Amino acid sequence: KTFKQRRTFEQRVEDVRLIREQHPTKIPVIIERYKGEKQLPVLDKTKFLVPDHVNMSELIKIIRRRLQLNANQAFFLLVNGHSMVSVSTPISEVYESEKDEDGFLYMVYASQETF
Numbered sequence: 001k002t003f004k005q006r007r008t009f010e011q012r013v014e015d016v017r018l019i020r021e022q023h024p025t026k027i028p029v030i031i032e033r034y035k036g037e038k039q040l041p042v043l044d045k046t047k048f049l050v051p052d053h054v055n056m057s058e059l060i061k062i063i064r065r066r067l068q069l070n071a072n073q074a075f076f077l078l079v080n081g082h083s084m085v086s087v088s089t090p091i092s093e094v095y096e097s098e099k100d101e102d103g104f105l106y107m108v109y110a111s112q113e114t115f
Ligand SMILES: CCNC(=O)c1c[nH]nn1
Pocket: 044, 066, 067, 068
C-alpha cells in the first residue's frame, strides 16, 4: 500500500542515487495522503522532484494546486512524521535535517491537524 511497503530499502536507496545523477538540483519527495483522511483526494503520483530553492510555504501552494483545492479547504503537511516548525525554510535545508536513511524526504497531508 505505502511507498515504503511497495519498494525495498535497497530499491529506494538506488532510486535516490539515480535522481542525484540525472536531476542533481532536485529534492526527491514522497507525498502520501494520511491513511485516516476522508475529505481531501489522493494525488495522481507519489514521487516528486522539487527544485531545491523553493521553501515549504511554496511546496504547500504547489500541492494545494495539484489537488485542485479551493480557498477554504484545510490542508496540513507533516514532514518526517511531524509538524514543520517553519514554512519559510528552503527545501534544501529541510532535506538535510529531515531526510530518511533511504535518502527520500517523506511527507503526509490531511484536513485535520490531529492526524
Ligand atoms: C488524474 C488527476 N491528475 C491531476 O490532478 C494532476 C495534476 N497535475 N498532474 N496531474
